[PDB]
Amino acid sequence: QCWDRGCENRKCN
Amino acid sequence: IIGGEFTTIENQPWFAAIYRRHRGGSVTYVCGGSLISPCWVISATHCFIDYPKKEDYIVYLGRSRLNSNTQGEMKFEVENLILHKDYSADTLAHHNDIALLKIRSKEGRCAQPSRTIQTIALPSMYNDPQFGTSCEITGFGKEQSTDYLYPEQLKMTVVKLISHRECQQPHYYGSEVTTKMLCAADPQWKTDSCQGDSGGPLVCSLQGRMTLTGIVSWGRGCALKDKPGVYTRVSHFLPWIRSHT
Ligand SMILES: *Cc1cc(C*)cc(C*)c1
């Protein structure tokens, strides 16, 4: 799931 | 910001625009923040946790547009990036989602007050508005969940504070919401914060004074029915703020 609006400036791995 | 209206920095003069410089020279928008004293911007830890290098960041005050120079704007580097030690994120909920950025111009100066650059007051301990109170949020975040770009012009909207009891209902967020958080939304679910608005202010007209009541933190999707925006409850972090400065 990718539910959260607060996901700015992440690596994602 | 989903819905709401476009605005200008003279209407939100405490709003800080935070960008990250990448190797190669490109600069991208990260998150919003709020000027709480001339040298200090407050934001959200989740905005920085994956790239916790202060040299990466650029902070603007007095800026109304994402990729344009506003007359009177001030550009800053980050002298100290202070993240909350006990930060964590669950599937939705963020915990201790609060950060401080000590700002410094290339000349070594802090913010200079003007028509377009002003500090916002902090609340006193545990002093929040009553649920049902209307408050404003400001940011450069997405205008629709399906957008992949941010708007060029700053936006604001007005949302109503939701009680802890309501926000903890099973169809809302259940026990994922805690007393260190505040929920706010539109009764008709037409306006809300979204991705890119994190770190920015939830400001309430509180007992005569415009007050930083919340920091945009998390939420399921954007402007979804029964899924409010969730905000770091600033009035529960005053010792941390005061201590780190
Ligand atoms: C699900 C998700 C969303 C964002 C914005 C970033 C990552 C890594 C994951």
What is the experimental method?
X-ray
**Same-domain check for residues B41 and B136:** no
CA–CA gap between residue B121 and residue B26 (Å, rounded)? 34
**One-character DSSP codes across A1-13:** ---BS--TT----
Question: B146-165: b or e for each residue (b if 16 or more CB lie within 10 Å)?
Answer: eeeebbeebbbbebbbbeee
Q: Is B208 exposed, middle or buried (0-12, 13-18, 19+ CB in 10 A)?
A: exposed
CA–CA gap between residue B160 and residue B143 (Å, rounded)? 19
Sign of the Cα torsion B190, B194, B197, B201 reads positive
R_g (Cα) of chain B, nearest Å: 17
Which 3 state secondary structure label does DSSP give B73? coil
| Alpha helices for chain B (secondary structure H) | 164-167, 238-244
- Domain span at residue B81 reads 13-119+236-245
Q: Which is the catalytic residue, given B34, B43, B84, B97?
A: B97
Q: Read off the tokens for B137.
A: 């949020």
Ligand 1 centroid to B47 CA: how many Å?
12
Number of domains in chain B: 2
Resolution in A: 1.5
A to B CB pairs, distance under 8 Å: 52
Residue B126's region, left for phi above 0, alpha for psi from -120 to 50, else beta, is left
A7 lines ligand 1 (CB under 6 A): yes
A2 shares contact with chain B (CB less than 8 Å): no
**Same-domain check for residues B230 and B126:** yes
- Measured CA distances, B77 to B18, B21, B104, B119 (Å): 10, 11, 5, 18
Q: Which CATH number do you get for residue B225?
A: 2.40.10.10
User: Do residue B221 and residue A3 have CB atoms under 8 angstroms apart?
Assistant: yes
- Within 13 A of B153's CA, how many CA atoms are on the CB side? 9
B194 shares contact with chain A (CB less than 8 Å): yes
The single-letter DSSP state of residue B172 is: T
**Same-domain check for residues B229 and B244:** no
A3 lines ligand 1 (CB under 6 A): no
CA–CA gap between residue B222 and residue B192 (Å, rounded)? 6
Catalytic residue status for B22: no
Catalytic residue status for B198: yes
**Same-domain check for residues B151 and B31:** no
Q: How many CB atoms lie within 10 A of CB B242?
A: 9
Q: Which is the catalytic residue, given B34, B43, B193, B198?
A: B198
